[model samples]
Target: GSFCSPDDVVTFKAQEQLQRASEQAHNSPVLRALLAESLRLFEQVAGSLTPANLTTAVEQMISLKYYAGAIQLCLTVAQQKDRGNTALSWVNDGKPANDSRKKAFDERKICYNLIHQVLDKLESDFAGEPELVDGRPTLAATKRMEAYNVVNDSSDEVFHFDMYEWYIEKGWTDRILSIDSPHVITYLQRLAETDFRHAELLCRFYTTRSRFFEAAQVQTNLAKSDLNISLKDRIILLSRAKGNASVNTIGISRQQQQQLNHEASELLEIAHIQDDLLERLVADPRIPEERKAEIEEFLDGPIRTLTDLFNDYADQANYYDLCLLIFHAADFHNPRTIMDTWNNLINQSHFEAEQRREYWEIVQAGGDLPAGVIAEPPLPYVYVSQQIQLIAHRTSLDSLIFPVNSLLPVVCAYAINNGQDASIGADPCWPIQLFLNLGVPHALMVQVLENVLDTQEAPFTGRRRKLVVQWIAMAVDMWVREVERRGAMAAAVMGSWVSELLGRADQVLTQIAGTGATLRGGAASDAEEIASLRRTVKGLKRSVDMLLGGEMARMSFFR
Candidate 1:
């Protein structure tokens, strides 16, 4: 055979030195010197070394405990292969590459694989060794950290999830948190399926990135699963989910806010299962009587905790439905708290209306409303209407009336003051319609209307008077229609109540007409003003009479 070329001779010598180095101690001076010489020899023939030769040399370096040398060799080859591939890629443009380029790709793959292998060896070698110095990682520990970076960088086209597991096992949370790759997330997601610890880590990861809704979802899913966690623990998990979902939406997008709010609702529903489970435990006959008290206390404690947490979320999100659901589930019969929440929602509606006004002013002056500001505004009363209807559906009518009595008057005042455009797309009289549909006692409805008209400090004139008359007319019409829908049976029970309402309405109409007369008599010098006032009062009286007549006719037909 002919003599080997100079590059081939250097490559063979490097392999021979790598093999001899493996016989010496890992940290021996002779081993280090030999590894350095072998790495130098390989670098001299690096361009001539085939992918197979490169793989063999790196494998020998790893076996020789020359981790740093192996990593450097892989990096050197990887850089060269990257350059070659990039050149080929530019030449090919949109066309597919030929087999020569495929060979270049394979070479790069070899570099990546070799780098991963070396990093894995380094991790195992350092596994049992002292890696810390005075509460800090020493250089040896730092090497493992650096190796993670190298492994991640080299395997860009293919992620190594085993590296993530190693990092997790080593408590390298900082490294885990720093990663932003979807593959890493998917890996964590898969791990979380069987291990709650990983689920918790994934939740931490999402929270650190401010993906609170996703974090909440993770917790919620865990809570729902048939894991071996205790009932109390499940509630605690759901409570954490609720807390994450209740985070302020100041910088959050509308879509995200909607999702968080919806998630909050779902978490509350799941939390109810704990209550049901505990109740069943309390009822079980196998339980000792002495233990039942403790179980009851446990039950009461979580109910109170969940009640407060849900109330906080509902307040923060202006989610009245959740608020009512909390009260209903907890059997929390606190009317004052419900009223306070309702008042808070009303105040928010006022705040948004003011904001819309400022935005409208900006638009009128040749400016546009900001995209964030231009979304459909909150309809607080509509939520109230819906929640009250939900209450009526599920609870006794007597229980429903207590909150409605406290709530309806405020709703009436809000409707009167804000009219049709109260909060964007809401109908101002939704509560009235809700009350009518629930067949709320006529006396309560009449009382709410009377309170709105009588308690307002503003004089009944202009738009204020018009809104009152309009609502009064609407309520009377709806009441009559409802009676007609029920036919003779409902009319038999409701006739006396309708008569009292009609009489009260007439008195209010007469009182309004008298106020106009007093104004006219005092301002007689303004004859034109008196004439206009007279015409207005006459029209109002005629309208009231017409409504009274229609109701009378519908009632007779029902009889």
Candidate 2:
């Protein structure tokens, strides 16, 4: 009886409490009484929910414009006879042979009068102050000032904001998005005057439907109103500029064709202007390479004429290519000099076998002299490093058997000649270090290190003297191993090179000693300096002792 009489929405929500009844208390009098009362109440509602009774009730309720009562009856119909058609206008809509089917279809008609009556009654009851969630109208509870806005604002302002969200969720807005109904656009256009946020959605909707002109006006209003439009849609609208739509109708007259032709001509003129600007930017050398790339790529699809011009341009036209031509090779005597040098270097591949001597002759003969006539001509250290590192990276470990009769000795010969003037302080002898560290076999590192060491007459300062000795030590150690590895082959050159390095170490020690002596009697009290020299002298003696005592200096000169 309670379920049948009261239509309180919360009591309908409370139907879940029936599950709370204790199933184990079958003999309990309280449970028995409650179950009997609940069943009686269920019968009161369910008896009226039979097929025939439900159909009559739904028809009556819909006819009376009572949508809630119709929904309740429809749910009843779904539970009893139909399931999926619960949201349909009636139970018998598609049953054509049934006599009441026409009435059922009529019940689903465009009920304009019913809609107007309910909306008018809603405005009267709420005084047009509908509750809003996140500023969109919702049925949730409202701010207390919404009650005040109802009294102060006129009916028109209040009505404009009231039902905007309702029409959206009620499928009217979807109709506009799909362009199903023409009047929905105008209806949304009018709504845009007050609720432009919803209007922006309409604009994007119209955009996707290809109603670009009306959408254009909508975007203009939304922007001028300082409203929020999606970033992507705004970019597309701005990109399209002023065009609404292009006409390509098949059943048009001559006059329409002429009009379309004229419009096409105007668009072509705009494209020509763009093409001219693209050419100007492309030719402008003042713009950076990165800027040129950005401007050119952004102009890709927009200017086909510009692409045509680019295709016909010179071989070295882009900014980077042009820079290479203007600046040219790095510090070359002449362009042909570098060109000939590469020709010589590339020819080394041809001069293999123990014709290695002839390959050295070709390398020495080619390339112009180093650029300046200074005492130490500047070599292309970067170029030499790049070439050597490449060879070291690609050449196999077993293949690095000291380059006795092949491509690498010639390469190492050129490496030594080019690096002859380079400073160990600055250049660090990447080629020699690469040979020693990586398994590249070259015997020329001793010469490279020896060339850089100015161990004579205190040419190096105190700390620098120590550094040169260490370099000589490392190079000597590597060469000593080289001799041990190739005993008979290295016997000719090995003795002299090791003796030369040891001589350089002797020079470094003598220089450090002389500086210590010079500073000895001065008031500066060169205690630390003399002490450092003594320690270095001892370490150098130890290194030489190890060289002579161990596997290194087994040649006749040390004995």
Candidate 3:
């Protein structure tokens, strides 16, 4: 059960029917296959003995959690079985024609087992290796063999130029020295006698590459935690700003640069707070063992020399030394490193059940459908493989469903399979509902719509506009189905779906807000939409006027 109630879980047959129905559009190879299997999983969960757990699982799939367990379950099933089985592909002659259908049927069982493991792990410390005899658990199995044994244990041990030949090869002039607070903090936590000296090498590595923004967000967070250390906050902020604008060009934009200036001025405004900036650093718990030894080493020796060096660098502004000093100072808390580690794919896979690990990884990593590692195109797909989007991440009559990570790839492979080359179809609309929720800019959307609709693929077939109109009508049909399924109780709905209702004053507001507020469509379409948009300014003003006292994020339907 969730924070709500588990009684909300639906029945198995209803769930199976929902799955069976969700991905009926089979025009795209990737779309038809993935939606089909995703449907199958929904069917299996609907048919489960533990429907409450299945219900709980479906709720998590829609969120953007840092390490969401439900999403991981879906990834595992799509990657391992659906993507791996050749029957899903329909390439008959490659391997022996075994009972591919049976194998596909068996795959859903794996999904259920993984779901159970995940639900249990979230609710309890249900240590995966549970006790068979007693209601208890065993020890974890996360271990490795990595020890540090070097000749010199002191900070003065000197990074022999050859020790840093790699940096020198990359060229110091080309190198932009940077102090990454998180990296330094990670080093600080793991610094110990045996391996404490090694962290300076990391400092050397970062300074050589010049990645300071990451360093600054960390150090700023650190100073708030470590109040014991005496310091000026401006010195910290300026060091973060790299003294002035000269250091910002690598990545920061003009607006971001100005925002930094405003922040730095404010930091100086509060410079006399007297308490040390060290007030915020939590004695972080995430560093690996070796770095803890290095921090102890710094406290014993390199730190004393560094205190005087820090004072001098404060006046003269040695950007390099400032980077080095802040790194060591910020290391007492190890929050950032752990966040990055869990964000990685390999570390995350370890959390899933053993049978599930590969399936989840493969679905997302590759093999499920056509997906782009980079950015998506700007326009919408008017005719995606001569088919419509198969919306599957929804509820059927009574079954608990797991979303398959199939949408992104299905459209991709389908576009190619349907004789479309280069994977580039005038716009993102070509991918069907790819940005239906995200909402592409209307100006761009219109440009794409006009680009496709304005040209006739030749009337020689005697049905140029008819064929095109049918395609647009079919796509619109999916769009309407999607909006209604999401609950048409709302006044407006936007995105490619809104293409149908773009001019309706009643629908505009609801659609724009729901689609993450991106003004979609091309230059031509904006005039009418923009006028409709202007009317909303007054409508929003009136709605908020009645705020009568409640939580800020609480948004009620209908003013």
Candidate 4:
């Protein structure tokens, strides 16, 4: 006798298991009748059946408790058309008969019962761990299971509203959020192939995943089909399709038109924020500093200061990418934000070759002309979501617990503005102003004080030194006032909190003044410089004490 190979053994094992289940299921009279009905339907379609086909037939009965076994069996054994014709052949077999007595075609629910039973057994066996079953990932293993379930409830290939009803009823919206992106995309692609009418749900899924362009594409298709859509979303959809800066301009009054244009243009600001040049540099994770530095030199000319280098690095360092690019594309008319800055640097590069003393010459030109840059230069492109930002800052300030970290960037805006120099290295005071404006918990205040003191030793000289000291004093005073602006309950707890920060600030001031080696080692004189530094520290302490005294007085008066 010929030896059975491992492949044959696996085949026989699967067939033996199927044979037992099939025979057991065959004992059911309803399923037996359905099996006979499928055989009758197959012959009516001019299809031939065999032992192999019979195995498939009974396997379907075992698995789904429906007598049809596998409709796909007919395709492999018969030559009618491609798989499509095979799918069409048994379209009515094993399904509940369309009867005048019933309100619907009626087999869809029975089909679901079959599918659910199979799913229940799998869920029971696997405990929901591996997505793959027998080295193949099943449809029911992930969120795509929703799409399959929806697809199954229909009579023929064409979709029905029943699927959409199922979609809403199943709480699929919440369930889908747990699915990973790729599986959703794959399921959606298959859905679009199965029934193009699924675009509404498809677009929603894409939107949730931040695939804005793809979502917009589906919406545009829906719009073309004359599907119901709201005016606001439809306008965005239309703009998305056309890639233009605008929305619903024709029917509105001139004032309304102007308002839309203004609103769209502000959103355009997000589309343009310096990423064309800046993104090219930083969006790439592969960017090396030497590569970035070479880019700086190629642009910023001969008069490159520490600020120019710093600004270059700062832009490159902070750049990140998001789906806003599609929205940005709508603003096709706007100039690239950072691109202009980059071009200016490039244009200045030409002048450097002609200069005798390029560095001094640029510095002499008021830092604007051809050179003279600030450290921590203003970002050319920052995502400016005006309404959301206003809401975040407004709500975070009054309605919530101290938003310690997220509030810093916004407070830094006020800080950066208050500082005389736009360059970052020159001042410790900006950070002080930032924390003071935001008002942190007591421990964070101590950390802030430590940071403020560390800034005293930063490599700053002359006006920069004076500027830093003055800003520190200003911030110290602002801290008291900003804290006073909070509610009485906050003040009751914060009265002691203020004292802790003040004591720490005073210690920091003494440490800064005591570091004579740092304070006096520069080209400046020692005694008057020491005295001025002494006075600034004294001024900060007095200001804090005075501010606290007034806060206590105000709280007392309010009571």
Over 51-79, each residue of candidate 2 has an lDDT whose tens digit, in order, gives 44434433433333233323333333233
lDDT of 4 by residue, 1-559 (tens): 3565543443444444445545554566654554545544443432223345444543454354332233322322233222243323233343234533232222223333333344344445447566777888764465335424533433343122333334445556664545564644554565552343455557666655555555544544443343344333444544554442233333345564444445444333332332234445644456887787676444322212223323454344433121123213233233344233323332333233224344446667765443433312122211122322333353354422223433333333333333423452334344444444444443454444335444543333323344344444555555555555653556553355545544554554454455644655464344465466557657656655655566456653555
Whole-model lDDT, model 1: 0.63
Error of 1 at 403 (Å): 1.9
The numbered model that scores best in TM-score is 1
For model 3, how does the per-residue alpha-carbon lDDT over 1-559 read when each residue is reduced to its tens digit? 3643332333343344334433346345544454334444554433332434444444433211111334344334433455444433332332345645555534444444444344334334334533343543322211000000111121211122112332333444232233343533343333311231333334334444674544444333333333333354334533554334325546767676566555544443233211111221112243345754543333322113334434433213322222222333333133343223212322222232232434555666766532532211111233222222221221121111111122223343333334333344344234434434334333333334333444432331222222223223334445434434444344442333233322232333344334433445533333454344445434432332322123122332443
Q: Which candidate model has the greater lDDT, 1 or 4? A: 1
Clashing pairs in 1: none
lDDT for every model?
A: 0.63, 0.43, 0.35, 0.42
Per lDDT, the best of the predicted structures is: 1
lDDT of 1 at 85: 52
TM-score of 2: 0.23
| lDDT of candidate 1 over 1-559, digit per residue (tens) | 4666787798889888888888776667888888899999888877677878888888888776667778777767655656545533532453265535656656655766677688778878778878788998887777666655555556433225435665687677887878777777876776675666688788888887788877777777776676555556667767778788777534667677567656655555645644654565566655688977865654444333555446433344455445555566566767788677666656665665667667777877888776666523235455445555665675555553346556666666666566544436656456677677787765467556655665554534432543454455567555545555655565553344444544554455555555645674372233443344445445544544554566545644522
Error of model 3, residue 548, in angstroms: 32
Candidate 1's TM-score: 0.37
RMSD of each: 20.4, 25.2, 36.9, 23.4
> Candidate 2 deviates by what RMSD?
25.2
TM-score of each: 0.37, 0.23, 0.18, 0.29
